[PDB]
Design a protein around this ligand. Sequence first.
Ligand code: A1L0M
Ligand code: CA
Ligand code: CA
Ligand code: CL
Length: 259
Amino acid sequence: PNPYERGPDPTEDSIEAIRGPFSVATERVSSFASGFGGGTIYYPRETDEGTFGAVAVAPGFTASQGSMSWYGERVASHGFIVFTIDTNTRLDAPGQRGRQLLAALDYLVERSDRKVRERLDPNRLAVMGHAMGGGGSLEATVMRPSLKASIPLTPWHLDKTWGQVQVPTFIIGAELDTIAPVSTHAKPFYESLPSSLPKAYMELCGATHFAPNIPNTTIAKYVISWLKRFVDEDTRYSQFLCPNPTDRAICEYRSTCPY
Ligand SMILES: COC(=O)c1ccc(P(=O)(O)OCCOCc2ccccc2)cc1
Ligand SMILES: [Ca+2]
Ligand SMILES: [Ca+2]
Ligand SMILES: [Cl-]
């Protein structure tokens, strides 16, 4: 009965697939837009099952949306509006990246053209980001507690305490990261999140700081599952999140399961 359920019942094969059951169309947003550097909107074409939630996606320091473009088709085809953004400058700090993620979401709600706006549920928004943009994902949830989900990917931030976060948060770390080492960024972040929050931490064996910038089935399958569970309230995806996954590519996993 869940009004936000989209797509057939999932399997291990369907969440690993490079293409979900929805066909995807795109829209380029100029950098002239206020509040962020523009980006690319990826949306599902089919409307017979209802509107969709959205996730804004930020890159890291010195990087552009091209470092995140593969999340666009992969995630949107499982039933989401996906907005891979550019920041105002490639040198913006994490707090700036959080502010601009929220401006990108507000663009979708308030400014987008009819093709996008009529496919969107403005009540169900989420944030995701890489490196400093993962620090921005944390920042955005403090700025806006009504967000449905947050996914910081190999996140970087000098602030190590996130005990006021109220948004379900999934931190992905890279075991051999030397730029944002898991021992000094991802793990203290995760441990400082409220213990009553639905949250998870996944550490990828042998991975580096730029693992999130190339197609990665392990990232994709649980990014999709997390957005499904919390943006769509879709408990069909709880089976992949709880108990903790044991994929060979995972070297540590922590969670507040069951949820
Ligand atoms: C300001 O403090 C820092 O130097 C610094 C702190 C954090 C991060 P990041 O968002 O986790 O990195 C993501 C992109 O790789 C960085 C990079 C790429 C290419 C050439 C040099 C550096 C980056 C830099
Ligand atoms: Ca702009
Ligand atoms: Ca464990
Ligand atoms: Cl690295």
